Amino acid sequence: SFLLSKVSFVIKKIRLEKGMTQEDLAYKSNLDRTAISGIERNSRNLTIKSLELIMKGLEVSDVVFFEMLIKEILKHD
């Protein structure tokens, strides 16, 4: 699907712009590394609560995240 693949793509794009490894995010987001890897490959089973934990771990506001998700969808869907 287009949404979960865009959510993952935006998580990875921000994590690398902040210079972070999957381990680093895992530790800051309170989710296991395998979880992070999994979501970055497919975000279908990401919950909203976890996505919030990920945003806190990237240190990115929800609003910014959503604005990048919309920009990605609009420009590339």
Place this chain on the structure above:
Amino acid sequence: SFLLSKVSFVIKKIRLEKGMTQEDLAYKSNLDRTAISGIERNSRNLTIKSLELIMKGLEVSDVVFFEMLIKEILKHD
């Protein structure tokens, strides 16, 4: 948790703007009515795939959804 409470607010807001019942949304979204009620009652997490199916069931684009969520967070914190 904060994100989920605004997501739950936006779902309910759109559902009622559209004049749809919870039963109607449940059927169109592939999610139990018990599920929908819990999501709106903040007593229940939600996956992105679930949120996707809800948007389809509301017949709103993800972009419009997320823009409404951003306005809600921004104007009302």
